Structures are given as C-alpha cells and as structure tokens.
Design a protein around this nucleic acid. Structure first.
Ligand SMILES: [Cl-]
Ligand SMILES: [Mg+2]
Ligand SMILES: [Mg+2]
Ligand SMILES: [Mg+2]
Ligand SMILES: [Mg+2]
Ligand SMILES: [Mg+2]
Ligand SMILES: [Mg+2]
Ligand SMILES: [Mg+2]
Ligand SMILES: [Mg+2]
Ligand SMILES: [Mg+2]
Ligand code: NA
Ligand code: NA
Ligand code: NA
Ligand code: NA
Ligand code: NA
Ligand SMILES: [Sr+2]
Ligand SMILES: [Sr+2]
Ligand SMILES: [Sr+2]
Ligand SMILES: [Sr+2]
Ligand SMILES: [Sr+2]
Ligand SMILES: [Sr+2]
Ligand SMILES: [Sr+2]
Ligand SMILES: [Sr+2]
Ligand SMILES: [Sr+2]
Ligand SMILES: [Sr+2]
Ligand SMILES: [Sr+2]
Ligand SMILES: [Sr+2]
Ligand SMILES: [Sr+2]
Lengths: 115, 246, 119, 145
RNA sequence: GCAAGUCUAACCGGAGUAUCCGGGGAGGCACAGGGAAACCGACAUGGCCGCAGGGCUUGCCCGAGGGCCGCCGUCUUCAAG
RNA sequence: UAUGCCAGCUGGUGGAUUGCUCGGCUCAGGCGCUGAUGAAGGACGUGCCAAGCUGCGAUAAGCCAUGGGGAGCCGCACGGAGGCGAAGAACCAUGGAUUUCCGAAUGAGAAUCUCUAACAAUUGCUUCGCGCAAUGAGGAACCCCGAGAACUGAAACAUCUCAGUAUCGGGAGGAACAGAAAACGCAAUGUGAUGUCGUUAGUAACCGCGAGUGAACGCGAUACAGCCCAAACCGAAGCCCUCACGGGCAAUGUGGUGUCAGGGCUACCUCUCAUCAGCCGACCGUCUCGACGAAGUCUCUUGGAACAGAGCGUGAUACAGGGUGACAACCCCGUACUCGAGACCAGUACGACGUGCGGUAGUGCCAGAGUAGCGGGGGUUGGAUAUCCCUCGCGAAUAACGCAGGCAUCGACUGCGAAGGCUAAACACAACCUGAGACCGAUAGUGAACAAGUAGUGUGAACGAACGCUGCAAAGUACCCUCA
C-alpha cells in the first residue's frame, strides 16, 4: 500500500497511457512500481553508460544514483534522481521525470528499460 | 510567482516574489508523519506502580481444601492478575519509549511541503478555513509587527476578508469523555496562523483559534494543525523572505 | 494550576482571609463609576439586587454573610419551613449585584476610594 | 488489522496445543542451551582457533582503488593539472586515524595520473603507468625495504 | 527520506521553553577482500543463451534484470585442486 | 383447575451501568539535613457539651510582637447554649512564649512510673572541678566502608551463572566518594587532576574455551582549579584559654622557610601582581509566594433555575483553568501585561589588603620502609604470565636514585617521582515545595478518595479489609388519625 500520493498518481498515469496510447513499457513500468520498494531499481550512471544508446530514451523503473561516469548524450527518464545524478546527467544529456516521458511519448516508442 | 503585499489598512502596497518553497509539491503523507512525531514527542512517560498488588505475603494452600490454587491472605485472594486487588498483568510502563524519530531531511521536506500547502486557496478552503479571498497566503506589511491592540488586528482581518475564519473558531466544543476530569474539557477549531519574524504577534495570538509563530522556527504543526495541510496563513513581508530558506 | 481538581481544591480549602473574594458581587453602574472597581466584597449592611435565582428581580439588605459556605442571606429572600417558620435561602454573590453600600467603617470606605486595592 | 489483533477468541494465539507455550522446555533450554547436543545444527562448531596480535602493534592502512581516483579526476579541480597530479593522502577519508595510505588497482585508469601515496599494489602501478602515468612514494613510503 | 553514502549520540544556542527551530558526524553501518598471522590486495564487462520491454520492411535485430562461462584478489600451494 | 413451566408487566432485592471526582499513579522543576539548647517517635492530657481526626501542652483547637487582612469569627462538623470582634477579632507571613511523661534518654531503677542532686558511658582540653567541650539517636531513598547467600541459568551438575545481587554490620552529607600523575603509551616534535554523560564495544580479555561474563586508552560533551605538609636551612622568633591577672602547651620542635614551574644553602640578576591568608560582596537567573488586573449579567422564548435557542452588544499583551440552579473571555476567582517579596545560586563572581613570581652559577644539603619488590596460601577481577585486595614469610635503593610503558632479565628510549594531606563545579536520590499528564476513575487507581495502616487476626515477628453521590435551596416532612 503505497503512501506517497505522487508515486500513486504517476502509476495511474503510466496505466492510462499504456491503455490509451500504444504504450506497454508504461504498463510494464507501472507493474514494477506497484511491487514493493525493495524490488524497485537503484541504478548508477555506470550502468546507464554501458547499455544506453543515443536517440533511445533510457527508462529506469526506479531511482537513478550517481556513481560512475556518463558520457553518452542520452535522455534518462526515472521516478527520481539523486541530486548528483541529475547534475552529472544534465552535463551530457537530459534528465526527465516519467511524468514528462509519458507526456511526450505516450506511445512509449524507442525506449530502453534499465535496472 | 508574485504575492501582493498589504498595508495595515487593507490596501495593496506593491508586491514581491513568492519564494520557490511555496512550489514544493504538497505531500500530506510526509506532513502527517511529521505532525504525528511532534505530538508523540511531547507525551509523558507513565505507568502503574511496579509493586502495586504485590505488597502481600499471600500464599496458595495448594490442593486440599476444595479451592483453586490461588494465593490468599486472611482468607482473601491476592497478588495474581485474576484476583480483585491483584497486580496488573501487562500494565503501562515507564520504561517504554513513547517518542518517534524523524530523519531531519524527511522532516524539513515536510515543513517545506506544508509551507507550499499554504499557497493553495483551494487546499486551504478544503481544510475547512472560512475566508473570501483568492490570493493566499496573505502577506502583510512589516509594520504589522508594531500593532499592539488585538482589535487593530480584527479591523485589518475584516479589511482583508479573512475574519470569517476567526468567527469559525469562536465556538468551543465541550468534548465527550473523561478528558474533562483531567482538564481537557474544551477544544476549538484552528484558524489563522500569523508568521512574523522579530516576535510572535502578541496582538493576534488571543484571537479565537489563532496561532502566532516566527519565520525562523515555524513548524509543520503550525502550518498543518493535526497533519491537515493548507492552513490559512498570514505572513509578514520579512517573514515571507526568511521562510524562503527553510 | 490549570488542572480542575486543584482549582476546585484551592477554592474549597482556601483559608478564611482568602475567602472574602468568594463573596464578592458586581457593583451597579453608578457605583462602578464612583469607585473605579467593577465589583466589591458584599457586606452585612449593603443593599443588593437578585439577578438570577427564583428571586431574580427582588432587592433587599444583606443580613448575613457566611465565608464558610461562601453565601449570603438577603432580607425577604426566604423559604417557608414545614412548620411555617420563614428561613433564609442562601445566595451566591455572583448571582447578585450591589446597589447601595454601607460605609460605616472608615477602613472599608478608605479602601474602596483608594486606587490600589479593589475592596 | 494485525495478527496480534486477530487473536482474541483463538485461545492458543497460534501456539498450537495449549500444552506448548510453557517455560524454557519449549525452547530446549535457555539461551544457547544444547548448542552441542539437541539444538546442535547450524552453530559454529566448538573450538579455539588462531591468535591475536596486540592492538598497539597493528597497522590499519587507508586504501583506495584507482577506479575511485580516476572516476573523479575533472571533479578534483582543486588538485593539480599538468601534462592530473593527485596526492591521495588528501583524497582518502579516514586518512588521519590510519597508519598509511595505499592505492589499490581495482578498475580502469582512463587518464595520465601522477599519484602520490605511501604504498601501491603491483596492479595499481601497472595500470597508472600503462596510461602514461607515474607513481611516487611518500617519504613515509620510504619504509619499503 | 536520502544515496556512494547515510544517521547523528551526549550535549550547545534559540524559542512559542519537556513539544519545536538551528547546531553537534564523536562515532556507527555501508564504500574490498582473503589470511591464524606476517602480508598481499579485485570484472566502471570478455563470450554465449535469453524473459520483459524497444526497434523493423513481422520472421529479424537491440536485448537492462536473469542464466551458463570466462577471468581477477587472496589462502593453501614443486604446481594443481 | 391444584403443585407447576416459559415470557412480560407492577413493586422489591441487588448495585452493574452511565455520568461525576475531595484520591491515586507517573513524569518534571526546585529544594534538602534534624538531635544532649533532649530530636524523630510514642504515651497521657487538653474543648461549654467532645467519642474519632486535626491542633495544642498544666499558658494545652491556644498566649505575645511586627507586617498583611478585614467584618466578621469560635477547625474537620450544616447542633444547641453562650461568647469574641472598630481596644480591628477571625485568617496569613515572619519572629517570640509556653512546651506534662516515656523516648539516644544520660543520677539509680521502671511495660510511659518511682526513688534519693546527677553530661550515665567513652573521650579531648584541663583552673584536674563534669570547669569547658565532643560522641550517642532520627531521616524517603541516594552515598561511602565492611560481611555476604540461595532459588536460578548451564535444559543434570561441581568451576562458571544468578551476583558482589538479596540480606546483615559500621558511617557521612545535602549530596556522597574521587581528584592535581612514581598517569597515559591513537609510541609521539603527542595528551596533561577527578567525576559524569554519549561513544569506543558486546570490541580486548575471561570461560567445563560450554552456558555465559566483560573493561580501558582515546574521542565528543558537561564542568573546570589548583594547592598544603614531612625534610633540608632557621630554632622559641610560636599556639590555646582568660577582659585582665594569670594558667596550659611547646627543644620528643611551636613558629619561619619550602612542596617537581623540585626545594634549600652560597653568589648574583630581576621582579612584584603566581600562590596562600584574610576583607568586601552582588547583577542575572531559577523556584515559590503576593499586589494589580479589561469587557453584558441586555431583549424574546423554553425551563424549577439561562451559562440554552433566537436577537442586540463588548474586551482581548486577558479565547488557560475553576466556580456560579444547564454549553460563560465579558456574573465571581483567576488568566495577559506590569510590579513586589523570600529562598537558592553564594559568602560565590568581581573588587580590594597583605604576601611575593621567576631566572643564572656552584653545591652528591633535603625529598614519606616492613615500603618497592620476591616467595607460600587465598579472595576478587575482563585482567589473560599482563587486575585489585587479604593473610604468612622474606626484603632495596637514595635523585649520581627509583617506579612505569599488559610475561621475565639486561641495555637503550619515552613517561613519571610511590610509601603524608586538602580541594569548588559538572553527576545520585526524592523526604519536602510546585508544576504537569494520549495514565486510573471507587472490585479501577495506593493496602488507604470514607474510621486507613482504620476495624480486625496473631504470644510475637508480622498480617490487614470494606464503606464515595438527597436537593437549586434543608425548604431534612407542621397538623391530623391509627398504634403499646
Ligand atoms: Cl548500478
Ligand atoms: Mg490493583
Ligand atoms: Mg464514555
Ligand atoms: Mg478603588
Ligand atoms: Mg533454543
Ligand atoms: Mg540448572
Ligand atoms: Mg560516584
Ligand atoms: Mg554443558
Ligand atoms: Mg589503558
Ligand atoms: Mg480499592
Ligand atoms: Na501490605
Ligand atoms: Na521511556
Ligand atoms: Na527541601
Ligand atoms: Na572533669
Ligand atoms: Na452567577
Ligand atoms: Sr495429594
Ligand atoms: Sr471552616
Ligand atoms: Sr464547614
Ligand atoms: Sr511460571
Ligand atoms: Sr556432540
Ligand atoms: Sr572521523
Ligand atoms: Sr544529518
Ligand atoms: Sr550478466
Ligand atoms: Sr582543567
Ligand atoms: Sr617523595
Ligand atoms: Sr617486554
Ligand atoms: Sr464495592
Ligand atoms: Sr501462630
């Protein structure tokens, strides 16, 4: 039983999208976010660096942390970013919230789920 | 955004920038958590006498006289929990920690989130307050801090169309239950919170349900009585600024 | 204290000199203006007017003042016993109002008039 | 509603037969009782092993992996730039209450680094130099003979 | 909630004076392990499968997580295991 | 339909329930010794009528003074009679008077009385006379010094554990104890009296190496404060009693010097501002107590009663709480603001008197013995070779020396001077004062809201209940009939 109202709306949004638009990643991300917090992702830059490719939004069904180096110009969408992750990322790419990703890409196309 | 400033007559006297904090996403779960902690942390440890019911050499005859093996003394049962005058099996204990820890970051995020709830007239109206404005919080000239008479503040609140909320609090409730036997016979609605910066407004504090606070130490409970976000606030131009850095 | 039990206790167990204040009554409008006080310690001799009981409306002279039970007897404010004898029905000074004062005592009079103590 | 709260009416509160939740017999003894008999399974076996050197004759080195130093070069703008030069002793936390600072070779060195520490590992050197870097021992580091 | 960090304890200052606001990182746990000890000190990825999800010209690619291996540190070691 | 069954009704019995709280329980702050000048406790008295409680002591619910207070009063306790008070009573604060007997109990004895001047007994001083003094006993716990279990855990049990606990003996104070290094040993070009709190840490160490037991240095805080002798070199330059005279003490050393920034002596330099002795003597703050203290008792309705409903109005640096015939900021107490007093902080801080700091050179002049240390036997401890202590035995050096740095010896290195002493503050407790409460609400909460340690049980040690609620006002039932 999530207690955070925001995480709760974000989930309702992801669903509305996956159902209305051609989403599936969004419904897949909502699925995981509905599971308990220990299962949510905690990803450091190093991993996003190792598997991300330009022109393919990285979607982390959790929170992005700041260990390691990110040089690729990638747009990372996540539930949250640590103050440092958002900073290190903005230097080479763009950090956006899933609320925005669903906004520009309700069809959830050209995306890479990273955990 | 921008917030309109008011002179002690109720007329607009320019305006200033509403600090970013007031943009903090209102978070009622974190707020209620913070308020839950403050309330618990002022509760007093208690518990019954450790020896209550134990002051007796009462013993149990055991088998033999057609009676249950209950400790008796002078023919009366004693000590045991099922005995009238017996000890209390699992009573309240002084040793119990009745406090609640709250990570400073989680708490500060709650104070900021509560601050933000203040700038939402809809939220404020939802919480129950009775006012007739569109802009809230209500910002006032620093000279507000110089008012001395309570009624000088009433006029200003009527001029600001905020006095109705005080009319709301001007109706105490006589609670149901024994609280009254322990001095808790009354309770009244929470109304306007005045946030100044130099000193708590002695002029406003006696107003029905009014709470006075200073910008450097105004807390979650001030901004959200009982964990309910969106209290009808009235900041002082200077207080508004100091609050920006909490 | 703020706790009810104590509040009542101090009232119920107050020494005698501290009981004079339990027999104080509000002063009439004229008398308030004349002595800068809102109320006064009801004395045997003062004239008072009942503002609340079954006798509200009536006026008479204060015949007795009991600090022990903190009540007063006012002329004609009485009850009739079964044998017919007419006995006084005690009044609480907060249900009464002083309209005329007895100032035969140089001391009392000086007190009311002074600005400091509120006789 | 919690488990506890649902117990009224159950009689045994989950303990099974009411002849169960009594004294220490139901636990097979108090504390670790039976650790070498009935409740012997999953217990460090009985024994006495090794020895300990006196605490004031022990040395606690402060260590750091090249990977940590490398991943933060640019970030360490307050630590020299030449043909980066870094005095580890000024990087590693816990360096005060430590006998000496050692650089370990875990990870990659994607820069030309000139490192200054009291000690390095064979692999730490190989990596730093292999990147056109150098390694310099402190004077304390002179205790390497 | 915060995140390669995280939390302060005693206590200090303020105040609306047991609440609360600020301060305090001593110290704890985590950030490297193996070895009784001396001492030594690691994969920011090299290969193959492949779930979800994405892409495409609708079987074909990309495939986090996961799976099977490689290799790396150390202890024991004539090596090896 | 008798005896009778089931349910209800009316009335009992009973006292649950609801509502109420004069009592509890817990937390917090403050404060903290009494006694031979006879305490604490107890007995017996003491009132117009008086059994219990409370008070008091043959001056007996009281006497006197100063201040406060005030028209009323004569306790709990609402009766009757009578009295006191403007000669200012009651009541409150402070100070004083009186204060039977037993009681440490002290002239001797004794179940609270008796018998023929009494510090009994043990001490110090001593005019060697009880002449001047001391001890005794009490106190809620806290504190210091000694004596010291077992149930229990180990699933038995002996070491171990429970536990240096329960309990016992002795003793101090308002706090105790500790305390200015023969320290530490993050080993150092480092720290710098002692408690305590947080941590170091369930780490090191212990241990049928089982169960279990269990520090320290350091660090962060609290609070901070350092000094005095013995001896050397001086040698009566001195101390106590007494108004004095005079007496007592003291060469077996009073008094000066000095005390590891070693000191003393000799010779110089310079200087005072350290220290030590003593004088004056708070601010503020905290706790409690007290003075002052705004504004409706307006209308209509209901009611036995308006604090209710409806309407009109007001204060607020005061909308805490209580009282008042029902829900009260404005009827009464009080509450905010402001002010005063006492206590504690504290005979402290500051200020001031006196004193004199320190440094150079020479000088083997001085520096705590059954000690340091070793062995036999024990206890205790985390202390393991390396804890602390007791007991029996043996037993050193002299600063050019000695001790410590977790086995012993020798050297080096670093630290430090034991075998004499004092020492504020920060910390424990809760009798006592005040405050507080998501505590209980009369089979609860104290054993005790009442007669409560009461009534009552036991030879005694000891044990030990139950009992709260008329009404707005006693208006607490006149007169009449019946009836012994
Ligand atoms: Cl990661
Ligand atoms: Mg009980
Ligand atoms: Mg109820
Ligand atoms: Mg007057
Ligand atoms: Mg077991
Ligand atoms: Mg056993
Ligand atoms: Mg102590
Ligand atoms: Mg065994
Ligand atoms: Mg040590
Ligand atoms: Mg009872
Ligand atoms: Na008892
Ligand atoms: Na507690
Ligand atoms: Na006291
Ligand atoms: Na004598
Ligand atoms: Na009244
Ligand atoms: Sr039998
Ligand atoms: Sr009385
Ligand atoms: Sr009475
Ligand atoms: Sr049992
Ligand atoms: Sr076995
Ligand atoms: Sr540190
Ligand atoms: Sr923090
Ligand atoms: Sr993998
Ligand atoms: Sr000091
Ligand atoms: Sr010495
Ligand atoms: Sr050695
Ligand atoms: Sr009963
Ligand atoms: Sr017997």
């Amino acid at each position: 039983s999530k207690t955070n109202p925001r995480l709760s709306s974000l989930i309702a949004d992801l669903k509305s999208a996956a159902r209305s638009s051609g989403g599936a990643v969004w419904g897949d991300v909502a699925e995981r976010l509905e599971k308990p917090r220990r299962t949510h992702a905690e990803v450091n830059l190093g991993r996003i660096e190792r598997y991300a490719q330009e022109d393919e939004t990285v979607v982390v069904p959790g929170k992005v942390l700041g260990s390691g180096v990110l040089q690729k110009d990638v747009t990372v969408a996540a539930v949250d970013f640590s103050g440092t992750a958002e900073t290190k990322i903005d230097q080479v790419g763009e950090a956006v919230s899933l609320e925005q990703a669903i906004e520009n890409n309700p069809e959830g196309s050209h995306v890479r789920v990273i955990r | 955004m921008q917030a309109t400033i008011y002179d002690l007559d109720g007329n607009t006297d320019g305006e200033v920038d509403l600090p970013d904090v007031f943009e903090t996403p209102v978070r009622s779960d974190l707020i209620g958590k913070a308020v839950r902690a403050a309330q618990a942390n002022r509760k007093q440890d208690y518990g019954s006498d450790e020896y209550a019911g134990l002051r007796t050499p009462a013993e149990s005859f055991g088998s033999g006289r057609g009676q249950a093996h209950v400790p008796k003394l002078d023919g009366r049962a004693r000590r045991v929990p099922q005995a009238v005058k017996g000890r209390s099996a699992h009573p309240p204990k002084t040793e119990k920690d009745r406090s609640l820890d709250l990570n400073d970051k989680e708490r500060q995020l709650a104070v900021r989130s509560a601050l933000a709830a203040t700038a939402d007239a809809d939220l404020v109206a939802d919480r129950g307050h009775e006012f007739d404005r569109d802009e809230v919080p209500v910002v006032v000239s620093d000279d507000f801090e110089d008012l001395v008479k309570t009624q000088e503040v009433v006029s200003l609140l009527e001029a600001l169309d905020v006095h109705a909320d005080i009319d709301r609090a001007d109706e105490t409730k006589i609670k149901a239950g024994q609280g009254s036997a322990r001095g808790r016979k009354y309770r009244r609605p929470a109304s306007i919170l005045f946030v100044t910066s130099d000193e708590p407004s002695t002029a406003a504090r006696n107003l029905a349900g009014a709470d006075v606070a200073t910008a450097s130490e105004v807390n979650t409970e001030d901004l959200a009585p009982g964990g309910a976000p969106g209290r009808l606030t009235v900041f002082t131009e200077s207080a508004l600024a100091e609050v920006a850095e909490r | 204290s703020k706790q009810p039990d104590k509040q009542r206790k101090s009232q119920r167990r107050a020494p005698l000199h501290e009981r004079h204040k339990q027999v104080r009554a509000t002063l009439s409008a004229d008398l308030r203006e004349e002595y800068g006080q809102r109320n006064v310690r009801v004395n045997a001799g003062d004239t008072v007017e009942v503002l609340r009981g079954d006798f509200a409306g009536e006026e008479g002279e204060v015949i007795n003042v009991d600090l022990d039970k903190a009540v007063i007897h006012v002329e004609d404010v009485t009850l009739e016993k079964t044998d017919g004898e007419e006995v006084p029905r005690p009044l609480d000074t907060s249900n009464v109002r002083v309209t005329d004062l007895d100032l035969e005592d140089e001391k009392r009079e000086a007190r009311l008039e002074s600005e400091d103590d509120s006789a | 509603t919690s488990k506890k709260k649902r117990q009224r009416g159950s009689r045994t509160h989950g303990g099974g037969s009411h002849k169960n939740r009594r004294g220490a017999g139901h636990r097979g003894g108090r504390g670790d009782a039976g650790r070498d008999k009935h409740e012997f399974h999953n217990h460090e076996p009985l024994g006495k092993s090794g020895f300990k050197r006196p605490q004031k004759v022990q040395e606690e080195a402060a260590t750091i992996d090249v990977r940590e130093i490398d991943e933060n070069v640019t970030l360490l703008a307050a630590d020299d730039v030449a043909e980066f030069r870094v005095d580890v002793r000024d990087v590693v936390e816990e360096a005060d209450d430590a006998d000496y600072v050692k650089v370990l070779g875990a990870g990659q060195v994607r820069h030309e680094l000139t490192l200054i520490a009291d000690d390095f590992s064979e692999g730490a050197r190989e990596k730093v130099e292999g990147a056109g870097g150098s390694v310099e021992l402190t004077d304390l580091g002179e205790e390497r003979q």
